[PDB]
Design an enzyme around this catalytic site. Structure first.
Site, short mmCIF file in Angstrom:
data_model
loop_
_atom_site.label_atom_id
_atom_site.label_comp_id
_atom_site.label_asym_id
_atom_site.label_seq_id
_atom_site.Cartn_x
_atom_site.Cartn_y
_atom_site.Cartn_z
N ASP A 250 -46.08 -10.70 2.41
CA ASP A 250 -46.20 -9.24 2.60
C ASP A 250 -45.68 -8.58 1.34
O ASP A 250 -44.88 -9.17 0.63
CB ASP A 250 -45.43 -8.81 3.83
CG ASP A 250 -45.29 -7.31 3.83
OD1 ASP A 250 -44.18 -6.81 3.56
OD2 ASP A 250 -46.29 -6.62 4.10
N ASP B 206 -44.74 -4.61 0.52
CA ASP B 206 -43.70 -3.60 0.68
C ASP B 206 -42.40 -4.07 1.32
O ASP B 206 -42.39 -4.60 2.42
CB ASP B 206 -44.26 -2.42 1.46
CG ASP B 206 -45.59 -1.98 0.91
OD1 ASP B 206 -45.63 -1.58 -0.28
OD2 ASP B 206 -46.60 -2.04 1.64
F1 ALF Z 1 -48.40 -5.47 4.62
AL1 ALF Z 1 -46.84 -4.76 4.21
F2 ALF Z 1 -45.25 -4.23 3.69
F3 ALF Z 1 -46.45 -4.69 5.95
F4 ALF Z 1 -47.11 -5.01 2.45
MG LIG Z 2 -43.26 -4.99 4.42
#
Ligand code: ALF
Ligand SMILES: [Mg+2]
Length: 361
Positions: free
Chosen positions: A21, A23
């Site tokens: 992931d 963020d």
């Molecule tokens: F997909 Al995300 F933080 F939840 F980059």
């Molecule tokens: Mg995230």
């Protein structure tokens, strides 16, 4: 043919699959124009810790709304991805847009060597709310591990390794947290972050306080070491899997194999094993306790969750409030009444911390 072939290829390369992931997991992004100001001033108190920050522009929405995104890499990212890529085939799977993911990829994987085209965004993942292993490994997830700062988007999947959310830009959360036209709410959120300048407001506040600690008067700091811990966890998972895979496959002529979905829970369950938790004022009266995020997170680490004193619990997680449960727990004995911090911190550090450092009353 590609999927099954992939599993065979990976086991031949002695690797697993890692879904990453973006963020607050390996980066932190903000559109607060304050960042650009601080970065252009070598004399600014935040200048030094912003030296490695990178930015790019994106035009989003029908109106072509444009924003300059400032991206901070979690400390030790380059080495982390480098080393882990030798053990895991990297995948990016973000709730950000394809354009967002591609801009971040150009910055953390300029050559395209780490991830390649193995990028997944909300544009092609199939869901705007949850993430699914099945989007990438429909028939076999026995070799895929996930690193994400949130467990709820993964429905607390057993293959998940929840990471401590990375918050470099203090006060800024996840900028990517009916449909299309209603997403005029995205433009609205980005616009609001730009106009309020949360960073400047907070920095000004720290400077306006006539306290004492000088460095504590600086808003931004590099204190994160989460990737070093994570590296150890992922290397361990990899070793255990291939250790069992060798024994498992040899004993059954390849009919049976190791499964990270079984290996990871095994490791986690040792952290809070023996703990029976009773919450007080931590979960809203309108939320089922046992199905809540805090409960599932705790339970994934071997903790037991109870709803009353019928069977006295080992711990009482209280919202720093004086309630009947707190009183009842104290009047009783052998309960350890602790702040929510004890739990979240212990879970984040895969280590049961001293209750002594989280007392309330
Ligand atoms: F997909 Al995300 F933080 F939840 F980059
Ligand atoms: Mg995230």
């Amino acid at each position: 043919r590609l999927e099954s072939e992939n599993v065979k290829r990976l086991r031949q390369e002695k690797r697993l699959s890692l879904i990453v992931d973006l963020d607050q997991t390996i980066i932190h992004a903000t559109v607060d124009p304050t960042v650009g100001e601080w970065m252009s001033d070598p004399g600014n108190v935040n200048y030094d810790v912003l030296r490695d920050v990178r930015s790019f522009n994106l035009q989003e929405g029908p109106s072509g709304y444009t924003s300059c995104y400032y991206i901070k890499f979690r400390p030790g990212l380059a080495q982390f991805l480098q080393k882990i890529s030798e053990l895991y085939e990297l995948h990016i799977y973000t709730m950000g847009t394809k354009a967002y993911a591609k801009e971040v990829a150009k910055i953390i994987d300029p050559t395209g060597k780490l991830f390649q085209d193995r990028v997944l965004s909300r544009d092609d993942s199939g869901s705007l709310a949850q993430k699914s292993l099945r989007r990438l490994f429909p028939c076999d997830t026995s070799m895929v591990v996930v690193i994400d700062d949130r467990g709820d988007v993964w429905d607390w999947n057993p293959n998940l390794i929840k990471v401590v959310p990375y918050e470099f830009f203090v006060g800024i959360g996840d900028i990517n947290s009916a449909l299309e036209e209603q997403n005029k709410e995205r433009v609205t959120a980005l616009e609001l972050q730009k106009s309020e300048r949360p960073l400047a407001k907070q920095q000004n506040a720290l400077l306006e306080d006539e306290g004492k600690p000088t460095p504590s008067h600086t808003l931004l700091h590099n204190r994160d070491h989460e990737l070093e811990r994570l590296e150890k966890v992922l290397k361990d998972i990899h070793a255990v899997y291939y250790e069992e895979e060798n024994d498992i496959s040899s004993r059954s002529g390849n009919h049976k194999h190791a499964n990270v979905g079984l290996i990871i829970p095994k490791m986690k369950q040792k952290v809070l094993k023996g703990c029976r938790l009773l919450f007080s004022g931590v979960i809203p009266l309108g939320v089922d306790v046992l199905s809540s995020d805090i409960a599932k997170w705790a339970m994934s680490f071997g903790a037991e969750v109870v709803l009353d004193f019928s069977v006295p619990p080992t711990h009482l997680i209280a919202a720093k409030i004086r309630t009947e449960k707190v009183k009842k727990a104290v009047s009783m004995g052998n309960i350890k009444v602790v702040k929510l911090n004890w739990l979240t911190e212990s879970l984040s550090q895969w280590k049961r911390l001293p209750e002594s450092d989280y007392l309330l009353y």
